[PDB]
Design an enzyme around this catalytic site. Sequence first.
Site, short mmCIF file in Angstrom:
data_model
loop_
_atom_site.label_atom_id
_atom_site.label_comp_id
_atom_site.label_asym_id
_atom_site.label_seq_id
_atom_site.Cartn_x
_atom_site.Cartn_y
_atom_site.Cartn_z
CB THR A 100 -4.67 -0.65 10.01
OG1 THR A 100 -4.49 0.75 9.97
CG2 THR A 100 -4.19 -0.99 11.40
CB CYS A 101 -0.79 2.36 7.72
SG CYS A 101 -2.06 3.58 8.16
CD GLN A 128 -8.47 -4.74 4.34
OE1 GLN A 128 -7.64 -4.54 5.30
NE2 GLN A 128 -8.83 -3.78 3.47
CG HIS A 172 -4.35 0.89 -0.90
ND1 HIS A 172 -4.68 2.22 -0.81
CD2 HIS A 172 -5.24 0.23 -0.13
CE1 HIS A 172 -5.72 2.36 -0.01
NE2 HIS A 172 -6.08 1.17 0.43
CD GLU A 214 -9.57 -2.73 -0.09
OE1 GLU A 214 -8.47 -3.24 -0.45
OE2 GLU A 214 -9.74 -2.38 1.09
CE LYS A 258 -9.58 -2.08 6.63
NZ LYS A 258 -10.04 -0.76 6.05
CG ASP A 273 -9.31 0.93 -0.71
OD1 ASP A 273 -10.43 1.43 -0.93
OD2 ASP A 273 -9.04 0.47 0.43
CD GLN A 308 -1.71 0.61 3.44
OE1 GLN A 308 -2.75 1.19 3.09
NE2 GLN A 308 -1.54 0.10 4.66
CG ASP A 332 -11.93 -2.18 3.71
OD1 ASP A 332 -12.02 -2.75 4.82
OD2 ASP A 332 -11.06 -1.30 3.56
C1 LIG Z 1 -5.41 -0.90 4.39
C2 LIG Z 1 -6.53 0.06 4.79
C3 LIG Z 1 -7.46 0.16 3.59
O1 LIG Z 1 -7.45 1.17 2.93
O2 LIG Z 1 -8.15 -0.80 3.27
C4 LIG Z 1 -6.03 1.43 5.24
N1 LIG Z 1 -5.19 2.00 4.17
C5 LIG Z 1 -5.19 1.27 6.50
O3 LIG Z 1 -3.97 1.31 6.39
O4 LIG Z 1 -5.72 1.12 7.60
MG LIG Z 2 -9.98 -0.44 2.03
#
Ligand SMILES: C[C@H](C(=O)O)[C@H](N)C(=O)O
Ligand SMILES: [Mg+2]
Lengths: 411, 411
Positions: free
Chosen positions: B360-361, B329, B194, B273, B331, B238, B172, B307
Amino acid sequence: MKIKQALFTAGYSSFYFDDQQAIKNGAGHDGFIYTGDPVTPGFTSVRQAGECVSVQLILENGAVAVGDCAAVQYSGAGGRDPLFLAEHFIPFLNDHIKPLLEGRDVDAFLPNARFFDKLRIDGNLLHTAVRYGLSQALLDATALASGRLKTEVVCDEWQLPCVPEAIPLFGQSGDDRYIAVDKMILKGVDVLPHALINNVEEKLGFKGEKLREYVRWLSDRILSLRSSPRYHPTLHIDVYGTIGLIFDMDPVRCAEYIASLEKEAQGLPLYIEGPVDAGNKPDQIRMLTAITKELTRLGSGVKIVADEWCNTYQDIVDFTDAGSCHMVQIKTPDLGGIHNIVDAVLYCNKHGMEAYQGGTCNETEISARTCVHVALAARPMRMLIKPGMGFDEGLNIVFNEMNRTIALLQT
Amino acid sequence: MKIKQALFTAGYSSFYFDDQQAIKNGAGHDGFIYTGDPVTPGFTSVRQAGECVSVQLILENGAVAVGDCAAVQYSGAGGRDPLFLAEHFIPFLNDHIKPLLEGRDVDAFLPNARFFDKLRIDGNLLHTAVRYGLSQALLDATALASGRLKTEVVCDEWQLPCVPEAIPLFGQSGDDRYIAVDKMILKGVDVLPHALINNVEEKLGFKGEKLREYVRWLSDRILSLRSSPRYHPTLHIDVYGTIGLIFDMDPVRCAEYIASLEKEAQGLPLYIEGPVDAGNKPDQIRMLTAITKELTRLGSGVKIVADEWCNTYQDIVDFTDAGSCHMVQIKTPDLGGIHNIVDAVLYCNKHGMEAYQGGTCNETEISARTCVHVALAARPMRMLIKPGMGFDEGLNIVFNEMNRTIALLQT
Ligand SMILES: C[C@H](C(=O)O)[C@H](N)C(=O)O
Ligand SMILES: [Mg+2]
Ligand SMILES: C[C@H](C(=O)O)[C@H](N)C(=O)O
Ligand SMILES: [Mg+2]
């Protein structure tokens, strides 16, 4: 306890191998890539992916000790060893090093560290990155075999008190010298921000006015953005030799400009790294000395930091013994085996030199995490946040390992 | 084996927490931050330091298991818990969780994961961040207690084969959608990049023409920079619901536009996405489903990924049962305890959905590393390179732990 098995696996480090010579010669760019041909041996492009080799040592009790073989961004240069390409090293390490690790006792660290640090294969000392990575794994192995943290092993073998205390951290911005400063204020960074002041025309300014304005903006940014006046960090800016280039390499004039920078810092202490690059070790020592003498003569509060030409434990001894500057960067990967880092920080501390346990954006999460233990033991005055040029990741890695480790120790 | 002591220490995660809709609203920008008023609770600034809480479990054999409590960047929205600040959670942890940890048996992992995932304190479930972190440490504890890797413990307890094989990685770029692309090509990343196409005016275009041109730029960059045709990554972008905005939530139109991007990818498979955001689960599932239907009807090879609104194990189950999209996703931090990641991925895999093990970042080196072990066991089709927005550090973390673990497993 012995090492039951030794594994070597290729990997990516947290930055890039760059051909310093081709870049200084003025290589152009196209996005993140550098154009033209490389001039340094081994390079396929001016900029290539950074690589490492992870060392894993499975011990008889089933623990897995780890270390990463890694080299500085400018792998091949200034007295640093060659272009560290990992794939090529896997077969070599499996053939010549594995049999020297398997069955080896790891109840202590230093005798092992010394062995690998002196070893020649077909006449050639082991690449400094290999020494770095093996030494990390051996330290971790001693820790895992005895129920100690890496920090404690160092404290024990060097007979140090191991009082659990934070080390001031230093953040490096790369060229992102405005946005990263904000990031660093938001996260309370103790020392900042490197600023990558590495071009005369565009970063220092031909008469130094660009750097001057940069320091003012930096202090204004800190004072303005901080939540409270309790945040009073130190400024540390690397000029990659450019100050000598605009003052005919005259150390008096260099000093004079340096001192003039203090005002712009607004009470924040100031450090200038790599003010000149005289082009060989002996002359570098002498010029730094002459610059320091003049700063004192001026009653300057600004300090200077050695880096280039100050690579090995012995170099660190030499710059120190000469009284050449106020701080020296112990650039971890170039020392080889990490016992050399401990030795170098203690020598500095004994003799009055401020030790900055630095490193490279181009190392790994493992090597940085290992360096945290080395620092908590040896007590340098400053530690580089690393690896990577993102800063956040580096802080996460160094800061949180430091604090986890302090808590464990306080137990 | 029991846990002898549990420590909780504050730290920094690898990004920032942002008050979303404080920003998208009109929060001002000065350097790296936002000016003015947060809308979200707890927040001292519209952007401040991302935080974590490291959980360390000292077991009876002296091993120290680790795991990190962390939350997404915009904690607060899409169905997510409050502002994960250390100063609040450390007391909560010492008051309410330490008493259930010290003395706890860790010979297995899943009972403990489930127990904490369901636990209520004054009627309330624990914060997903707390559950994510404890579960990571509990898995690590079971591993360290028995001479297994975390991945093996998952394989043992869900009865999976643990074939030592890589998982495709996705990087990303954050807003740096050009430069980070070069990084990724130079590091051979499997899936990219991304692109954070998160604003109609500047990134997608009022008619999607900017995203159109970006996809062509990206495919050309790849085909131009790569060293051979052996590098044929998957493109994954995304658009954070922006395609729904310019098409007024008309799904046939969304699909038509999404299919027209295939041409631009030049044979690299394409994933889009978050094409729309219907602002609620049941509508989200319906809208994605109609987009998927129309894509298939057109014969398009472009796939879409859920997502937003697909948060929990059960959500994933629901998006999957509706046949709503080609990939979801997962998450990771929003699922709470990591055993849910395992169940989610296996569920997808069993019901014809591509599992994308995201995150996540704003998480940590430890959470990411732990996520590597979950993936090698469960086998999602894709895994996020995290944490951080620098990309290099994340790849170093995720890819090197992956390859190191594969090597151990082959032992
Ligand atoms: C990966 C995540 C997303 O956009 O889907 C978002 N960039 C994050 O880093 O939390
Ligand atoms: Mg996303
Ligand atoms: C810390 C180093 C220095 O400039 O002294 C350099 N920026 C590096 O990451 O290798
Ligand atoms: Mg330097």
